[PDB]
Amino acid sequence: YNVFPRTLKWSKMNLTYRIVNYTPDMTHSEVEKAFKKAFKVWSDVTPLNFTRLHDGIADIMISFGIKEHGDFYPFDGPSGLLAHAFPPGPNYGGDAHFDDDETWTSSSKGYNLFLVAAHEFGHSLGLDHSKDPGALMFPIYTYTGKFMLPDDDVQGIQSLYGPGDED
Ligand SMILES: c1cc(-c2csnn2)ccn1
Ligand SMILES: [Ca+2]
Ligand SMILES: [Ca+2]
Ligand SMILES: [Zn+2]
Ligand SMILES: [Zn+2]
């Protein structure tokens, strides 16, 4: 037999993702780079592997959309809601949606796509919000320039997947 696990998490270390569409605000290459790096944040501290698919069904489907976009979490136009992702689970589990009425950047302007994606993918992997204001998973976006995953987030993700190679 098998009972349900303690926490929502992926039962496999190999995860796929697909960028289903692209924001007008950035080039395809900038978007792809920001998401690659956002995934690397998590894979660097776990045994998780992330492979990109160009078509088909992925564990983590990534899309930009506005207003009603095919779920119970419709966006609100410019300002307010920003992005959201679903915990691991069947179908839409793992998926990450970005509001294309916000402005997305690879700078300190607007919302940095890398930082928000890194936060969203934490949700895609099984992390909820942290109370640590310095943590990546703190609910409120702040821009940081340098990237070092804060220890609250390292401990959180490793509680789910282990550390993988510690050096
Ligand atoms: C997107 C990004 C964030 C975030 C980045 S750093 N700390 N929180 C929170 C909510 N939505
Ligand atoms: Ca999915
Ligand atoms: Ca919005
Ligand atoms: Zn959505
Ligand atoms: Zn969040």
Curated annotation (Swiss-Prot):
Q: Give the span(s) annotated as Interaction with TIMP2.
A: 73-143
Ligand binding (Zn(2+) 2): H119, H123, H129, M137
Q: So where does Ca(2+) 2 get bound?
A: D59, N91, G93, D95
Q: Where in the cell is it found?
A: Secreted, Extracellular space, Extracellular matrix; Secreted
Q: What tissue expression does the UniProt record report for this protein?
A: Detected in fetal cartilage and calvaria, in chondrocytes of hypertrophic cartilage in vertebrae and in the dorsal end of ribs undergoing ossification, as well as in osteoblasts and periosteal cells below the inner periosteal region of ossified ribs. Detected in chondrocytes from in joint cartilage that have been treated with TNF and IL1B, but not in untreated chondrocytes. Detected in T lymphocytes. Detected in breast carcinoma tissue.
Which residues are involved in binding Ca(2+) 1?
A: D25, D100, E102
Binding positions for Zn(2+) 1 per the UniProt entry: H69, D71, H84, H97
Q: Which residues are glycosylated?
A: N14, N49
User: PTM comment for this protein?
Assistant: The proenzyme is activated by removal of the propeptide; this cleavage can be effected by other matrix metalloproteinases, such as MMP2, MMP3 and MMP14 and may involve several cleavage steps. Cleavage can also be autocatalytic, after partial maturation by another protease or after treatment with 4-aminophenylmercuric acetate (APMA) (in vitro). N-glycosylated.
Give the positions the UniProt entry annotates as the active site. Answer: E120
Instruction: List residues binding Ca(2+) 3.
Output: D76, G77, S79, L81, D99, E102
Per the record, the similarity remark reads: Belongs to the peptidase M10A family.
Cite the domain annotation text: The conserved cysteine present in the cysteine-switch motif binds the catalytic zinc ion, thus inhibiting the enzyme. The dissociation of the cysteine from the zinc ion upon the activation-peptide release activates the enzyme. The C-terminal region binds to collagen.
State what this protein does. Plays a role in the degradation of extracellular matrix proteins including fibrillar collagen, fibronectin, TNC and ACAN. Cleaves triple helical collagens, including type I, type II and type III collagen, but has the highest activity with soluble type II collagen. Can also degrade collagen type IV, type XIV and type X. May also function by activating or degrading key regulatory proteins, such as TGFB1 and CCN2. Plays a role in wound healing, tissue remodeling, cartilage degradation, bone development, bone mineralization and ossification.
The name this protein carries in UniProt is Collagenase 3
Organism of origin: Homo sapiens
Range within the parent protein:
104 to 272 of 471
